[PDB]
Symmetry: none
Subunit: 88 residues, 2 copies
């Protein structure tokens, strides 16, 4: 599955959006992996998952240090996005 | 808005050796190479005094690290204007 961006760097409190594109439409869902731990499936004013055609968008509001990690989508898989938080 | 193919995904090489990376895209947009090392952040690739060379042939853009130094351990990907697309990139490991 095609996902964008590859990398992403934002300041604590900001927001971001990850996009997963796919014409093969089944059941899509996002995950978050921290380091070498097992990926935990994402669940939704903090985490918003949407869809519009072949486009699926993950949104992360009020970002924060405990959000660094890789975000990828799976569908009945992508290389995902790595998020690095910053601050002020 | 394109989806860039790239090869390889991973590459392990001994210090002072050479590697080529390839990404393909028929989309006309301006393509450029990036490097994300450690916890820094991506950086448009540098001339490297001519150690790192960027060639191209048709739709096949190539990156070539010569005499690989331990300092090149990272992820190398292509960025293309269109939004703007990225490729999954290559993980280079220096042994």
């Amino acid at each position: 599955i095609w996902q964008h961006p590859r990398f992403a760097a934002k300041k604590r409190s900001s927001m971001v959006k990850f996009h997963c594109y796919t014409n093969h439409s089944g059941a899509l869902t996002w995950f978050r992996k921290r380091g070498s731990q097992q990926p935990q499936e994402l669940v939704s004013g903090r985490i918003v998952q949407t869809q519009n055609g072949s486009v699926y968008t993950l949104t992360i509001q009020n970002i924060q240090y405990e959000d660094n990690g890789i975000y990828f989508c799976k569908q009945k898989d992508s290389c995902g996005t790595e998020l690095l938080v910053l601050g002020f």
